[PDB]
Short mmCIF file of C-alpha atoms and ligand atoms in Angstrom, two decimals:
data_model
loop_
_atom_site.label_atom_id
_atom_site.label_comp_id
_atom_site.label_asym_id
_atom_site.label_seq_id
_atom_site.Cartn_x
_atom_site.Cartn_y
_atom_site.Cartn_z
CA UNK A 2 216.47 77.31 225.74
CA UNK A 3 216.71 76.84 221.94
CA UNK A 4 218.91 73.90 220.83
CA UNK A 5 222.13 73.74 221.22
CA UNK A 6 225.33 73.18 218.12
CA UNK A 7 228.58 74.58 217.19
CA UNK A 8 229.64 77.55 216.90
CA UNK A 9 232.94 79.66 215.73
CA UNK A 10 233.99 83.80 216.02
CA UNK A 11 236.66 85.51 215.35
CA UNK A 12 237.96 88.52 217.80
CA UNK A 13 239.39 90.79 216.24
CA UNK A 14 242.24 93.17 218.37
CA UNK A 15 244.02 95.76 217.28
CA UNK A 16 246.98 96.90 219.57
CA UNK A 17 248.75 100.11 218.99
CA UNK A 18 251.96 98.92 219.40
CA UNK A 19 251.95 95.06 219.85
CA UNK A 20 254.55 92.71 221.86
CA UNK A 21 256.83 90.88 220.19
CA UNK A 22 255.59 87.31 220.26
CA UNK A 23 251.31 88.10 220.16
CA UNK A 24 249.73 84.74 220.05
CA UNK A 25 251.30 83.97 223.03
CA UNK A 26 248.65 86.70 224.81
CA UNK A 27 245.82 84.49 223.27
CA UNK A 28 245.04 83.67 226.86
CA UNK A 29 245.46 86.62 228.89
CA UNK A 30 244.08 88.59 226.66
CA UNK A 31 240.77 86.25 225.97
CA UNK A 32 239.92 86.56 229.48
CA UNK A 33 240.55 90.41 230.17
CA UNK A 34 237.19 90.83 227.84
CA UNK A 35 235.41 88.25 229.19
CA UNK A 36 236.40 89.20 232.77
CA UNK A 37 236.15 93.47 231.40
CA UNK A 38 232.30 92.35 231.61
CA UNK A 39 231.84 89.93 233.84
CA UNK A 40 234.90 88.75 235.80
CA UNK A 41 232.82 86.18 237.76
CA UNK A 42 232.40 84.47 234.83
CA UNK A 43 235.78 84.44 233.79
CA UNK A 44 237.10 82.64 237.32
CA UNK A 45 234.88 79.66 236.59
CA UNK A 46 236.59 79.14 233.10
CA UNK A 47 240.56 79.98 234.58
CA UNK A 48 239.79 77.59 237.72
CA UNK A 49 237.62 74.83 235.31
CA UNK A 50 238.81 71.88 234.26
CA UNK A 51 235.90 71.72 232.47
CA UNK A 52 236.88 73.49 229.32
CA UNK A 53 233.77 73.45 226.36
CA UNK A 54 235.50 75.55 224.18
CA UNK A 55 238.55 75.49 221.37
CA UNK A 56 240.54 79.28 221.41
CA UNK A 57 243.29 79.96 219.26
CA UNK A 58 244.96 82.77 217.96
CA UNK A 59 244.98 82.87 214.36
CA UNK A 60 248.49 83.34 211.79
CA UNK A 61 248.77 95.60 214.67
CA UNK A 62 246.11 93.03 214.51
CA UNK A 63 245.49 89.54 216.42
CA UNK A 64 243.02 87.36 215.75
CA UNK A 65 241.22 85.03 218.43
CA UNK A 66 239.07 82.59 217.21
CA UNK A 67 236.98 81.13 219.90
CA UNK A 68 234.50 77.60 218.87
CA UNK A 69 232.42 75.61 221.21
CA UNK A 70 230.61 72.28 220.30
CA UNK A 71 227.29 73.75 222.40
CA UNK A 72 225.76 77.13 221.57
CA UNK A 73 224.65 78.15 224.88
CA UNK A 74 227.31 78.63 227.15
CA UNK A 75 228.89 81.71 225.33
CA UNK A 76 225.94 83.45 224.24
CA UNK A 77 225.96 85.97 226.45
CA UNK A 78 229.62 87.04 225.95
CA UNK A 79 228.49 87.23 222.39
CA UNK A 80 225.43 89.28 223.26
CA UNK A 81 227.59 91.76 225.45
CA UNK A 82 229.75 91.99 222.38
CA UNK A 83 248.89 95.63 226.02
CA UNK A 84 247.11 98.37 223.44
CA UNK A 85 245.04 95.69 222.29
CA UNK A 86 241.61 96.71 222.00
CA UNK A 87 238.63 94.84 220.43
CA UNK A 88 237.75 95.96 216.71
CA UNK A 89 235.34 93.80 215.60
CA UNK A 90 233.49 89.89 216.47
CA UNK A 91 232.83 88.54 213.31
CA UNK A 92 230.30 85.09 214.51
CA UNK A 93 229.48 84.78 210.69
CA UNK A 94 231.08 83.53 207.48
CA UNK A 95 230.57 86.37 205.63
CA UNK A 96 232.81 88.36 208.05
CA UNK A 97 235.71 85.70 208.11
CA UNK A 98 235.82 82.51 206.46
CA UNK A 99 236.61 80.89 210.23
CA UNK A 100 233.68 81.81 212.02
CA UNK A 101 229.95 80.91 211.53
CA UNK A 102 228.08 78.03 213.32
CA UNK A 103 226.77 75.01 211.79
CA UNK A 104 223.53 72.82 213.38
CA UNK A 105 224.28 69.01 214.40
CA UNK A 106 221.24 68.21 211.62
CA UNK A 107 223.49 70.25 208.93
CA UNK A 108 226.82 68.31 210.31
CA UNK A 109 224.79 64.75 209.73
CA UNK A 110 224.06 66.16 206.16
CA UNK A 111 227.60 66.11 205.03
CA UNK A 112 228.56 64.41 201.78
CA UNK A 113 229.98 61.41 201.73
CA UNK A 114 234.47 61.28 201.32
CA UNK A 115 236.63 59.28 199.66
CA UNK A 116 239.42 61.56 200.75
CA UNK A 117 239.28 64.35 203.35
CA UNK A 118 242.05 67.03 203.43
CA UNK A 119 242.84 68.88 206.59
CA UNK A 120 245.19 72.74 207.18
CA UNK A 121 246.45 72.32 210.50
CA UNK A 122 246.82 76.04 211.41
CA UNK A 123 247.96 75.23 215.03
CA UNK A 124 249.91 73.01 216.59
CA UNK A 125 248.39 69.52 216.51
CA UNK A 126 249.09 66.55 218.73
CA UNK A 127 247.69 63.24 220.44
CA UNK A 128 247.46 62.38 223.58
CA UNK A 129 247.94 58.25 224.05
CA UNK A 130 247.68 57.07 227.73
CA UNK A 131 250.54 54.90 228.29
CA UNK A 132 250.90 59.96 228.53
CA UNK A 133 252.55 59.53 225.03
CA UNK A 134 252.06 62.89 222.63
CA UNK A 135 252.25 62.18 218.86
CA UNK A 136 253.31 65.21 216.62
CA UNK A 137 252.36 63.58 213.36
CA UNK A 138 249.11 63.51 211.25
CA UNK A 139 248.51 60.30 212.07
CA UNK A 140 245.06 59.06 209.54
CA UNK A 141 243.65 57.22 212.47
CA UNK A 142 244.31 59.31 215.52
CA UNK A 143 242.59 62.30 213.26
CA UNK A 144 239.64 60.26 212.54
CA UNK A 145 239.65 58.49 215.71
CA UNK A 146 239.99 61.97 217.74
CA UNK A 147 236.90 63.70 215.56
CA UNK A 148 234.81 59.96 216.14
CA UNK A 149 235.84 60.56 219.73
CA UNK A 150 234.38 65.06 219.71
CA UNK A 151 231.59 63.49 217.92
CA UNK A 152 230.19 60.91 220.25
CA UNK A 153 231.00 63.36 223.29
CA UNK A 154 228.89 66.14 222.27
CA UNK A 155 226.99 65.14 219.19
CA UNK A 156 222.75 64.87 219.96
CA UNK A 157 223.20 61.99 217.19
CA UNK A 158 226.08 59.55 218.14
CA UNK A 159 226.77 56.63 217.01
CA UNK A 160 225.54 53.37 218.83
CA UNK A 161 228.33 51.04 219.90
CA UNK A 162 228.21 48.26 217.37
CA UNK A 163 228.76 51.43 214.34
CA UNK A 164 231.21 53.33 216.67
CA UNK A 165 233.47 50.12 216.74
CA UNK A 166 232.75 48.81 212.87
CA UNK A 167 233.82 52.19 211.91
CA UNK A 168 236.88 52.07 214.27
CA UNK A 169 237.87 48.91 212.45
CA UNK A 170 237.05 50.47 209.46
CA UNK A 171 239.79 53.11 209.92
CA UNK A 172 242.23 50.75 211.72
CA UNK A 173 242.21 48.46 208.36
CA UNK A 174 241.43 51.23 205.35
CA UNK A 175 241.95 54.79 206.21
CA UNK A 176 245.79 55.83 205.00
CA UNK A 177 247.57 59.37 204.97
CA UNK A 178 247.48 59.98 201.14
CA UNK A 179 249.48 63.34 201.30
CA UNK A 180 250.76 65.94 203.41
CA UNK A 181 252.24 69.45 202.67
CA UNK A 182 253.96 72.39 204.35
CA UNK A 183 254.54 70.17 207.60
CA UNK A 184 256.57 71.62 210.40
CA UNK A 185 257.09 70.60 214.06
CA UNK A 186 256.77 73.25 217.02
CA UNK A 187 256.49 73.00 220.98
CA UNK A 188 254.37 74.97 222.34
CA UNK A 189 252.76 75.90 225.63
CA UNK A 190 249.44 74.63 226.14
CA UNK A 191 248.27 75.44 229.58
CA UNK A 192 250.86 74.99 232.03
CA UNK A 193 252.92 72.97 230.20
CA UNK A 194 254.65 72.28 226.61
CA UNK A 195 253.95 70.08 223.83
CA UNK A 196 255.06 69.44 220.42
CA UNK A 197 252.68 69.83 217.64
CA UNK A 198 252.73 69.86 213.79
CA UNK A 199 251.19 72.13 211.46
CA UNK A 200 250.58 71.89 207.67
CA UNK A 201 247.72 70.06 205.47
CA UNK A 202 247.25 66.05 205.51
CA UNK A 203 244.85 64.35 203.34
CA UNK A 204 243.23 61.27 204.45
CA UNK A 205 241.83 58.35 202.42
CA UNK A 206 239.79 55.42 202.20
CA UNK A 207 240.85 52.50 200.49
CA UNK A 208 237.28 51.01 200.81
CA UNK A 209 234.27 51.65 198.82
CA UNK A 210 232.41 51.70 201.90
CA UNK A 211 228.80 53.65 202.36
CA UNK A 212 228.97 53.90 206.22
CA UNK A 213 232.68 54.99 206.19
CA UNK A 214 232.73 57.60 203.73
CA UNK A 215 229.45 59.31 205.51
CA UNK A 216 231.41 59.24 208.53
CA UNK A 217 234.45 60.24 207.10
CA UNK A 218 232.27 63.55 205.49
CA UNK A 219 230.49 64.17 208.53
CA UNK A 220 233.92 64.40 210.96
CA UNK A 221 235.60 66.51 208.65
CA UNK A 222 233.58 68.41 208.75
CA UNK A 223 233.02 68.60 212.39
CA UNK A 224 236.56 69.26 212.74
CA UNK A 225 236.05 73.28 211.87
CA UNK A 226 234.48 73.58 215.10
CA UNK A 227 235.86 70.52 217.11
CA UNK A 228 239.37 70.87 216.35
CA UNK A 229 241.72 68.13 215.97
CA UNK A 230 243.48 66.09 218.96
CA UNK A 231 244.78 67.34 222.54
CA UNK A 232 244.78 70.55 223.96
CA UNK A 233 242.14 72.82 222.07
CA UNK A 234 241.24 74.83 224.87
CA UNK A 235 245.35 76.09 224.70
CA UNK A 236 245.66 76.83 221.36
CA UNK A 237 246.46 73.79 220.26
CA UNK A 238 244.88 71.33 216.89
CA UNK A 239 242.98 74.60 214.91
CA UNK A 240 242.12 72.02 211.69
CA UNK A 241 240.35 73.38 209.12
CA UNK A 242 238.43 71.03 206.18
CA UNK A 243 239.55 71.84 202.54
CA UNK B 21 286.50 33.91 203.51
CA UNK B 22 287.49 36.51 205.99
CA UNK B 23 284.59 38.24 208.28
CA UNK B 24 281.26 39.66 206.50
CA UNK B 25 280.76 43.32 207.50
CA UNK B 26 278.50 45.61 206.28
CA UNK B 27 279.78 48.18 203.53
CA UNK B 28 278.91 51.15 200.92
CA UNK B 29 279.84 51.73 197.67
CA UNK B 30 278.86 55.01 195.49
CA UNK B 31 278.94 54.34 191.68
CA UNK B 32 279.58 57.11 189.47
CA UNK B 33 277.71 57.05 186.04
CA UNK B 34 278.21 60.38 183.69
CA UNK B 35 275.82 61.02 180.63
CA UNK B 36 276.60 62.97 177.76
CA UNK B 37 272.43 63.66 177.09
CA UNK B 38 270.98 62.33 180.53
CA UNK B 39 267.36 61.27 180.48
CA UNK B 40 264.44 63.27 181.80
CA UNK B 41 263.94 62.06 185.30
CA UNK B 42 266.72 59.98 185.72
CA UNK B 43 266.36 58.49 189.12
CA UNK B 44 263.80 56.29 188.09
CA UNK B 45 266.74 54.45 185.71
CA UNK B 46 268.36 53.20 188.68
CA UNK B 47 267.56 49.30 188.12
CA UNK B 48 267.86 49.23 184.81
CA UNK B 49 271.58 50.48 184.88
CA UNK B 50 272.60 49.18 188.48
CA UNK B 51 271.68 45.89 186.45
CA UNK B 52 273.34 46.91 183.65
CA UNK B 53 276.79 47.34 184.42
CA UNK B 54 276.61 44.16 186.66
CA UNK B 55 275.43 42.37 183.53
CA UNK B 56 278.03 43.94 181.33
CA UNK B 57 280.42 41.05 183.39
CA UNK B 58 278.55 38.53 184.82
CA UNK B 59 275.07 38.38 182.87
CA UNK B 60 274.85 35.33 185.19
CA UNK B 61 275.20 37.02 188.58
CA UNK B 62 273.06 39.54 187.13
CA UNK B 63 270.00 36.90 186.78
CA UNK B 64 269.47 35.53 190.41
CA UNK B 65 269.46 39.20 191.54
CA UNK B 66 266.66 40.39 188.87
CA UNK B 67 264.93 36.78 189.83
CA UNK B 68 265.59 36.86 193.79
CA UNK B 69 262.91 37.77 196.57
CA UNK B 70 266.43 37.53 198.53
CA UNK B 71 267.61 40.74 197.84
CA UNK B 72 270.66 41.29 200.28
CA UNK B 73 271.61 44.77 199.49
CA UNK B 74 270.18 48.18 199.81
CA UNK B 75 270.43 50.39 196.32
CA UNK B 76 269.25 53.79 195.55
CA UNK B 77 270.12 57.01 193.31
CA UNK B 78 271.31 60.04 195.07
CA UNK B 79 269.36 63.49 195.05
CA UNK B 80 274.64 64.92 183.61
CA UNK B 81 276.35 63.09 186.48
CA UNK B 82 273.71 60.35 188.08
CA UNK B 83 275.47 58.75 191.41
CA UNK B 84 273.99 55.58 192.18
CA UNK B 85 274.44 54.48 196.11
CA UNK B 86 274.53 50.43 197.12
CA UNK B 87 274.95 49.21 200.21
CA UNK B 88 275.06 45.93 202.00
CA UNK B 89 275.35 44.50 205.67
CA UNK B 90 277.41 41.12 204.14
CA UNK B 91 280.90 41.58 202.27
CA UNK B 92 281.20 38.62 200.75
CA UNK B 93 278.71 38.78 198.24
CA UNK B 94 279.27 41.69 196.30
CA UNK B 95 283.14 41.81 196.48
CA UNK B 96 284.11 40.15 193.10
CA UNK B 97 281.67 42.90 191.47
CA UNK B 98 283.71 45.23 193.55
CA UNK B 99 286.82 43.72 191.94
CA UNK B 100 285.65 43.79 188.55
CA UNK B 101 285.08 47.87 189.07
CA UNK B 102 271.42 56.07 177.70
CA UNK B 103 275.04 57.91 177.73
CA UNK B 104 276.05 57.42 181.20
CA UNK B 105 279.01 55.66 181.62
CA UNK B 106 280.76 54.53 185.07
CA UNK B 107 283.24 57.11 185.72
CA UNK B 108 284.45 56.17 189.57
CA UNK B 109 283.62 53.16 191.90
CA UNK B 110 283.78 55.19 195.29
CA UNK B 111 284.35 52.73 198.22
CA UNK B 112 285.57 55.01 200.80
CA UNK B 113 284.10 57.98 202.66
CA UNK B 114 287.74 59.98 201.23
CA UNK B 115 286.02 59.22 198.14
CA UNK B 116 282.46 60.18 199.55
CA UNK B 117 280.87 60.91 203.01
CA UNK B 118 278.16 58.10 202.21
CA UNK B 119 280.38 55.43 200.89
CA UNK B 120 282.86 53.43 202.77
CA UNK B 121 282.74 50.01 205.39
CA UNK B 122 282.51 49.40 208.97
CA UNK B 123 283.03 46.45 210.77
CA UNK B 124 280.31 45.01 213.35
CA UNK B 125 282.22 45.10 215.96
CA UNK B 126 282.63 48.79 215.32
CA UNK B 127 279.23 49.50 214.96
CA UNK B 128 278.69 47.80 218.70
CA UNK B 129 281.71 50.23 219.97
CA UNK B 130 279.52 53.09 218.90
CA UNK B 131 278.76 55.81 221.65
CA UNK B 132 275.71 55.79 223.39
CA UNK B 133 272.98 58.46 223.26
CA UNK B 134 270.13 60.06 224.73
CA UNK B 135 269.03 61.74 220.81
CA UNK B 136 269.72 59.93 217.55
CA UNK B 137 268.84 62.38 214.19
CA UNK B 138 268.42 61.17 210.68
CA UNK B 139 268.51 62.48 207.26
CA UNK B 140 266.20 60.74 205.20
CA UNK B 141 267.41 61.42 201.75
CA UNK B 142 264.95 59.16 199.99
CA UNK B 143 261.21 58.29 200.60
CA UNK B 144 260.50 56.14 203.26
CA UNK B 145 258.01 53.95 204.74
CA UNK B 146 257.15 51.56 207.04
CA UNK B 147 255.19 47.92 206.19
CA UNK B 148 252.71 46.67 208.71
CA UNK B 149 250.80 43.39 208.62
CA UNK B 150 247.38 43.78 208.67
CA UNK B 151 249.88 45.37 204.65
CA UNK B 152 249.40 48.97 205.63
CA UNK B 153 251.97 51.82 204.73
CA UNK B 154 253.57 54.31 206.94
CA UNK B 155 255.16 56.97 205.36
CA UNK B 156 255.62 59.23 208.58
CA UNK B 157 258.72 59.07 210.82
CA UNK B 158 257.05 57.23 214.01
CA UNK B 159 260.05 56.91 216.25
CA UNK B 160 258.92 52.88 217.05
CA UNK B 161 258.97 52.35 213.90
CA UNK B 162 262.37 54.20 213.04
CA UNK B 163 264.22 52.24 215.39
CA UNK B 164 261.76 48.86 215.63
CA UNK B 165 262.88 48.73 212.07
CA UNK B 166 266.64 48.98 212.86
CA UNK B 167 266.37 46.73 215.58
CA UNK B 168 265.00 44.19 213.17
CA UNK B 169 268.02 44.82 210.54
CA UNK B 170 270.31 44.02 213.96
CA UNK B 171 268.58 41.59 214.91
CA UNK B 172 268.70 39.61 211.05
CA UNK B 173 272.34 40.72 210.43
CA UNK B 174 274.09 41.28 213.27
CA UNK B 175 276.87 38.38 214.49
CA UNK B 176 275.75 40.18 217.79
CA UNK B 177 272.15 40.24 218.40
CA UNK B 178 270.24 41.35 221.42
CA UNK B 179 269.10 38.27 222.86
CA UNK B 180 265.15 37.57 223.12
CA UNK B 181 264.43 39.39 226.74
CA UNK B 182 267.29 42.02 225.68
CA UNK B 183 265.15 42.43 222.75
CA UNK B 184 261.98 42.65 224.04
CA UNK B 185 263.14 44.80 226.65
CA UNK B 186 264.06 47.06 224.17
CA UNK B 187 261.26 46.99 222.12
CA UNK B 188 259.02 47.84 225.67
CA UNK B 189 261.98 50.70 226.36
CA UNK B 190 260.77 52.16 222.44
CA UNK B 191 257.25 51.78 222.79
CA UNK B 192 257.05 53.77 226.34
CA UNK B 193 260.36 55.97 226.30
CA UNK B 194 261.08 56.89 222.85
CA UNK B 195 259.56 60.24 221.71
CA UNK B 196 260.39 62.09 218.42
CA UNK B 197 261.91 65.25 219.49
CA UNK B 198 261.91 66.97 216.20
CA UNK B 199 261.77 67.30 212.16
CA UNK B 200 262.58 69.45 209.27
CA UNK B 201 262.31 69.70 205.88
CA UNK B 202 259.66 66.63 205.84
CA UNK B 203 258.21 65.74 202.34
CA UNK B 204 255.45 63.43 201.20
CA UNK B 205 256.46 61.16 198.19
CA UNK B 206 254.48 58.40 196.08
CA UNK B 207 257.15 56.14 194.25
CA UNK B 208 257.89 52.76 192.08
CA UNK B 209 259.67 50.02 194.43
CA UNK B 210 259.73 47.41 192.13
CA UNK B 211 256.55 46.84 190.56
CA UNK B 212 253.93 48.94 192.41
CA UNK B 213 253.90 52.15 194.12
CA UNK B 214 254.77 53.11 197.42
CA UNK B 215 253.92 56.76 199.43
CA UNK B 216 257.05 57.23 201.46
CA UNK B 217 258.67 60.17 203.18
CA UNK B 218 261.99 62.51 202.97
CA UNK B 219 263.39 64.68 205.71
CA UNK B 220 265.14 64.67 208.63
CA UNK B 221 263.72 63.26 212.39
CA UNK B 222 265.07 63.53 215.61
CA UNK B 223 264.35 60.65 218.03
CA UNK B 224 264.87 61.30 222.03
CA UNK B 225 264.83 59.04 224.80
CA UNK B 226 262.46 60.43 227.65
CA UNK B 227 264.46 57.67 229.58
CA UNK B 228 267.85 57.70 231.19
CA UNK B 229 268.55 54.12 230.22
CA UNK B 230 272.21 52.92 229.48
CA UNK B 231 270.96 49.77 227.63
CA UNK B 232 268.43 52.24 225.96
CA UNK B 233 271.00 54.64 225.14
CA UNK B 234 273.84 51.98 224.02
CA UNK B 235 270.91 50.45 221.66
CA UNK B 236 270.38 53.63 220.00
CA UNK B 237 273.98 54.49 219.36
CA UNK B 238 274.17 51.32 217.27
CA UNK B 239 271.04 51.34 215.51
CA UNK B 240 271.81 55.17 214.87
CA UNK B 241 275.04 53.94 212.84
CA UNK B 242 273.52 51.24 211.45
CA UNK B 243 271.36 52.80 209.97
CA UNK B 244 273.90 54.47 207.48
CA UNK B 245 274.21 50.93 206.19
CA UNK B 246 270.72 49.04 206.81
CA UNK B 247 268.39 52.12 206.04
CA UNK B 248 264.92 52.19 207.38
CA UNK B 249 262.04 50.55 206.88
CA UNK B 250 260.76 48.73 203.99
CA UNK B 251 261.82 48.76 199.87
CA UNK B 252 265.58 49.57 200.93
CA UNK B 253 266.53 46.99 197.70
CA UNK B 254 264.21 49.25 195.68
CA UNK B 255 265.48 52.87 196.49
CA UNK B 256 263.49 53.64 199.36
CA UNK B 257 264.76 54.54 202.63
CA UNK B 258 267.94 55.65 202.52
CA UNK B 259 268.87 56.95 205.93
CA UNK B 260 271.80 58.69 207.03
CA UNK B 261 272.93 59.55 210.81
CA UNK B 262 273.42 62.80 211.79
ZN1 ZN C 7 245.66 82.97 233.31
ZN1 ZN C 8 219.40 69.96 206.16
ZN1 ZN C 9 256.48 64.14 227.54
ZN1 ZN C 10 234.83 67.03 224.68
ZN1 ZN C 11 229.49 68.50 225.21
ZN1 ZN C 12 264.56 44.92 185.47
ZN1 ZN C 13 287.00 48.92 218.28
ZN1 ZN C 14 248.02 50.25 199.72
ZN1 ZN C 15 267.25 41.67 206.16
ZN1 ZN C 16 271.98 38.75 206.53
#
C-alpha cells in the first residue's frame, strides 16, 4: 500500500448519563466500536501482545484519542467511521488540536532545540529492568524513551555510532530546566497499577551541539504521536510538545 | 569537651521596614550577627570550603534556621545569644517544632520503617560527578545522600559491606511511593545558581528488610538535622521528616 507514518484521532462519545469515574471505560469502551464492526478484529488486539497503538482518554462527553506510529493498521476502522455513543472522529487538526498525522519526512524536518517543553496529560512513567518504574520527568529517560519509539518504527533511524554519540550526548548535557503543575497518580494500565506523573517539564541542552539539537527537535516532536515512556497502549505517557 | 551531637537552632530577626525579597539576605545577616562578637570566628566561616553546618531562611519577622551534626563548634555562639534585629535564639522544639538537639545514639534508637515522607521546605538538589544537577526527588538519591551524611558524621557508621549492602537494598528495593505539592526552583548557593526542588516525597521499601527498614528510620530522622543533598551550607535542602 501507500507509505506508512503516524497518525492521531480523537473519538468523540457522548453518554447520556455518564459513570462516575469515565476514563476508566477508555478500554471497554474503545473496543465495543471496534468490535460493533468487526469483532474479529478486536480479539486480535485484546489477546495481542503486540500493541502498535497509544489510546488514552483525554481530561456528557469523553474523549479517546487513539495514535499509531504506522498508518496502515487502523485505516479501516477509520474508513468504517453505558449511553456512550460516538459523536464525531476528528483524524485532523482542524477538528482538535490532538489529532492529525504527520509523515516520517515531515518528523526529520523538525527544527533544531535548545530546549524542548513537554504537557504530560497522562500518567507518565519508566520502565528500568532491574522492573523498576520511575514517576518523575526524568531529561534522559524522556529523550532516551522517544530515541528508543524512534529507532523502533522510524523508516530513517539512526545508525549505531549516532544512536550512541547522541546517548552520550544526553547522558552528559541534557538537564530538566523546569517543570510545572506536577502531580503523582497510580493508575491501572492493563492488568496492573503504576504510578505516573503528569504536568509540563522542559528539557535542555547545555551544548551548542548541531546533531543534538536536530535530534532533540525531531523527538519532540515525535512524542505527539509516540507518547512518552511505559504503558501507552493503557493510557499511560499522553506527552504533548509545546 | 563532652559528646558532639547534632543540633538546631532557629534565630529570630524582626525588621521594622523588611527588604523586598528577604530570603536572599540570609548570609549577609547569619554573618552579621556572628560578626557583631567574634569578627574573627566570623572570617574562617566566610573563607572556609569546610562549612560544617547547614543554614537556611524559613518560608516583618525573617526566621533564619541553622543546623549542625557537631556541638562543639557552634556552642560559644550559642552562648553569646536593614532593621531586623535578633529578637529570640530558639534552641528547643518548645520554642519551635524545627529547632532543638538529638543525640546520636538517639537517632540510632529510632523506629524502623517500611515508608519514610519528607517535607522539603527549601529547593533541593542532588550533585553528580560527571557535575550534573538533580533537582527531582529520586528516592536513591534521597536516602544515598543521607547515608553519606551518616556515613561522614555518624560515631556509628554502617560498616563497608553494611554499607554497600544498603546502597544495593536502595538501588533495587526503594521506590518513591508518592509526592505533593512539588515545585521547580532556580536559586543562589553561594556564588552561582542552582535549580532545586520543594515539596514533599514519600519513599517506600518494596522490601521487607529489617536492616533496610532500621536504615531508613535513622536516615529519616537524620535528615531533620543533615538535610538532603547538596548546598545544605547555602540554604538549599532543608528537609524535614514527616
Ligand atoms: Zn477487555
Ligand atoms: Zn518537507
Ligand atoms: Zn512495583
Ligand atoms: Zn514500539
Ligand atoms: Zn513499528
Ligand atoms: Zn558574604
Ligand atoms: Zn535511648
Ligand atoms: Zn549546570
Ligand atoms: Zn559532611
Ligand atoms: Zn563531621
Amino acid at each position: 500500500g501507500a507509505a506508512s507514518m503516524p497518525q492521531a484521532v480523537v473519538l468523540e462519545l457522548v453518554g447520556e448519563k455518564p459513570p462516575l469515574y469515565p476514563a476508566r471505560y477508555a478500554h471497554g469502551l474503545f473496543f465495543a466500536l471496534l468490535s460493533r464492526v468487526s469483532p474479529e478484529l478486536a480479539q486480535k488486539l485484546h489477546e495481542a501482545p503486540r500493541k502498535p497503538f497509544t489510546l488514552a482518554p483525554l481530561p456528557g462527553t469523553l474523549r479517546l484519542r487513539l495514535t499509531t506510529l504506522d498508518d496502515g493498521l487502523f485505516a479501516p476502522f477509520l474508513r468504517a467511521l453505558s449511553s456512550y455513543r460516538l459523536a464525531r472522529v476528528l483524524a485532523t487538526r482542524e477538528g482538535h488540536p490532538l489529532a492529525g498525522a504527520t509523515s516520517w519526512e515531515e518528523l526529520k524536518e523538525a527544527p533544531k532545540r535548545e530546549k524542548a517543553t513537554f504537557r504530560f496529560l497522562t500518567p507518565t512513567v519508566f520502565a528500568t529492568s532491574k522492573t523498576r518504574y520511575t514517576p518523575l520527568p526524568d531529561p534522559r529517560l524522556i529523550a532516551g524513551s522517544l530515541l528508543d519509539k524512534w529507532q523502533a518504527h522510524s523508516p530513517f533511524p539512526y545508525n549505531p555510532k549516532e544512536e550512541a554519540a547522541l546517548r552520550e550526548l544526553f547522558e552528559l548535557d541534557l538537564e530538566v530546566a523546569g517543570f510545572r503543575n506536577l502531580r503523582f497518580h497510580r493508575v491501572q494500565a492493563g492488568k496492573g497499577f503504576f504510578p505516573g506523573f503528569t504536568g509540563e517539564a522542559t528539557l535542555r541542552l547545555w551544548s551548542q551541539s548541531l546533531e543534538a539539537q536536530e535530534a532533540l527537535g525531531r523527538l519532540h516532536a515525535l512524542a505527539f504521536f509516540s507518547g512518552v515512556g511505559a504503558k501507552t497502549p493503557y493510557g499511560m505517557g499522553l506527552a504533548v510538545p509545546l
